[PDB]
């Protein structure tokens, strides 16, 4: 279990809308092997209470899916609990709300760092900043995984939506 700082006055309303997944910093089983298999991933965030409704749209087996999660209130502005074995702790670490965002997630005591953007090209200084941040998050330059830059799902399709909510 590990703890660092959320966005000062983190503002769910400013952070709302669509984000594009650019890179994951992690070491899970999956991301080393089936690495070459990352699908283009789009996050849709909307405020709901001190929680946050989060839709993720992506292909399974070449159909667009939509996963509906709930980034529930930790009681700390900026931290979010999510939940299969594990407990997901989300941290909004860094973000202008207009271009990029850096998220952390802890599960079964283990960190992962996510980088999102409103559009590509992302900036390189932003890529650097996130690289710099992972190499102090204690994961290696080989443990960064850059996701696709095209292939993003439009809308999921009523039959094909996961409703973890």
């Amino acid at each position: 279990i590990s703890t660092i700082q959320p966005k000062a006055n983190f503002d769910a309303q400013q952070f709302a809308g669509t984000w594009l997944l650019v890179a994951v910093g992690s070491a899970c089983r999956f991301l080393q092997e089936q690495g070459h298999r990352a699908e283009a991933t789009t996050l849709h965030v909307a405020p709901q209470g001190t929680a946050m409704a989060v839709s993720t749209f992506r292909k399974l087996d070449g159909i667009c899916w939509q996963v509906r999660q709930l980034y529930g209130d930790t009681g700390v502005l900026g931290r979010f609990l999510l939940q299969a074995r594990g407990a997901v702790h989300v941290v909004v670490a860094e973000t202008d709300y207009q271009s990029f965002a850096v998220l952390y997630l802890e599960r079964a005591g283990q960190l992962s760092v996510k980088l999102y953007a409103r559009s590509l090209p992302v900036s390189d200084s932003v890529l650097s900043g996130f690289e710099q941040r992972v190499q102090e998050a204690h994961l290696t330059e080989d443990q960064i995984f850059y996701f696709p830059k095209y292939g993003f799902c439009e809308a999921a399709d009523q039959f094909h939506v996961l409703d973890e909510v």
Binding site: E39, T56, L60, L82, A84, R85, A87, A108, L162
Partner: protein
């Protein structure tokens, strides 16, 4: 009637054992002649002792035709030599192996049965704690037995690993050599009970040390409720013969002298338990205490039942809220009259977690909720190392000494239906605030005195008595 306080009494140090080549160590011990009861002064020193030693002469190699690991003396059948599996903790069974192909049985792809490691731990009944491993939770020894998971099908996403998939990786759980059987229980409508208590002590009663984290609220302005449930996710049975012991235990067990030495054997018991588990159930407990401000409750026009009811929906369970919601902060807590909530949750991957949530994870990370068990020494008869009769009589002998030496009955009397507690070499009392003496000074008491000493033989038969209404036998026969 303040009982006269007592000074602590330790025996003399026993004579040092001989030295021990395979670590260059001397040992000695002394015994708890008398613990300090009331304001008796502590006895500073410890009951075990040791010393660097170097009169060592040579340093278990016993493994006939079988393979043997480097510095564990675990005996392996030679076919587990280079088979794509660590059967020794040295790894020296998968070592030097260049040109060697290995079958998979598509089996090592899977996790061990949930709880395997907890189930292999020894257990100490005096303290109710877990000791170190007795069985090797992770030895498969060429077996590929598996337990099927009905749920493996559910589609799931996994934000940390950006993985969307049905879950082919928990279709089965591998069952280690030491487990005869392991079955999952379908989660059933496990009923969550609800009780309401006048005051801290009436609530303690039901149970009997968060009792400490609670003697902050005995102030009669505080009422209390609790949320309790128990859940079983699995039944399991340990193997009875050809048990493979944890290599650590194997070390200790070998490092034991065949000439009786109490201190050696007590140290062993201390490390590995008075008992080990032969079987039981996996699962957990979802338990909460609600601490409530009485006056503030009444002022909102509300009852304890009402607060339990809103609390339950912020968890999703079944049997004002203009700030309660989830009950996620001290401010929100307070608001709805709630001073504090205490988490007694055991099992599941301290704060607050929902029921639907805890119940989806418990299967995967349970505790041992129920269990049969047997004295540590009865495992020696049941191992691959075969006979060990000196070692076992020694260990039986010491267990009966140990289970007398450190029993809390030696803690005087504790009046007021007060609980006597032995800690280290000092006796205390946890009789909750209602009498005040060191032994606590209208409803009566009853409690058995310690078993006296074995009364020496009248026709190959000894007697052993006790007195104070205390329940059970007051006499036995050996």
């Amino acid at each position: 009637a303040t009982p006269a306080a007592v000074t602590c009494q330790l025996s003399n140090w026993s004579e040092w054992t001989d030295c021990f080549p395979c670590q260059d160590k001397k040992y000695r011990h002394r015994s708890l002649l008398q613990p300090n009861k009331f304001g008796g002064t502590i006895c500073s020193g410890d009951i075990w002792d040791q010393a660097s030693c170097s009169s060592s002469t040579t340093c278990q190699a016993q493994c006939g035709q079988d393979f043997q690991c480097k510095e564990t003396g675990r005996c392996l059948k030679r076919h587990l030599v280079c088979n794509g599996d660590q059967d020794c903790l040295d790894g020296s069974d998968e070592d030097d192996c260049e040109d060697v192909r290995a079958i998979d049985e598509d089996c090592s792809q899977y996790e061990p049965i949930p709880g395997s490691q907890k189930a292999a731990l020894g257990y100490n009944i005096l303290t109710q704690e877990d000791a170190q491993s007795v069985y090797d939770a992770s030895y498969y020894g060429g077996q590929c037995e598996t337990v099927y998971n009905g749920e493996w099908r559910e589609l799931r996403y996994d934000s940390t690993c950006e993985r969307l998939y049905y879950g082919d990786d928990e279709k089965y759980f591998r069952k280690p050599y030491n487990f005869l059987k392991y079955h999952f229980e379908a989660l059933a409508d496990t009923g969550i009970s609800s009780e309401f208590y006048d005051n801290a002590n009436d609530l303690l009663s039901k149970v009997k040390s968060f009792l400490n984290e609670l003697n902050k609220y005995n102030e009669k302005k505080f009422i209390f409720t609790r949320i309790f449930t128990k859940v079983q996710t699995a039944h399991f049975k340990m193997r009875k013969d050809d048990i493979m012991l944890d290599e650590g235990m194997l070390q200790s067990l070998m490092e034991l002298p065949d000439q009786y030495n109490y201190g050696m054997y007590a140290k062993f018991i201390n490390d590995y338990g008075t008992h080990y588990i032969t079987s039981g159930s996996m699962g957990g407990i979802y338990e909460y205490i609600l601490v409530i401000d009485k006056a503030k409750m009444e002022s909102l026009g509300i009852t304890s039942r009402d607060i339990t009811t809103c609390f339950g929906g912020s968890l999703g369970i079944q049997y004002h809220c203009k700030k309660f919601g989830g009950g996620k902060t001290e401010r929100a807590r307070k608001a709805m009259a709630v001073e504090d909530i205490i988490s007694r949750v055991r099992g599941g991957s301290r704060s607050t977690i929902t029921y639907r949530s805890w119940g989806r994870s418990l299967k995967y990370n349970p505790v041992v909720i129920d269990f049969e068990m047997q004295p540590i020494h009865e495992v020696l008869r049941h191992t691959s190392l075969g006979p060990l009769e000196a070692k076992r009589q020694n260990l039986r002998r010491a267990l009966d000494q140990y289970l007398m030496e450190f029993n809390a009955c030696r803690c005087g009397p504790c009046f007021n239906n007060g609980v006597p507690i032995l800690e280290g070499t000092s006796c205390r009392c946890q009789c909750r605030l209602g009498s005040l003496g060191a032994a606590c000074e209208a409803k009566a008491d009853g409690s058995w005195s310690c078993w006296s000493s074995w009364s020496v033989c009248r026709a190959g038969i000894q007697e052993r008595r006790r007195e104070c209404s205390c329940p059970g036998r007051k006499v036995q026969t050996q």
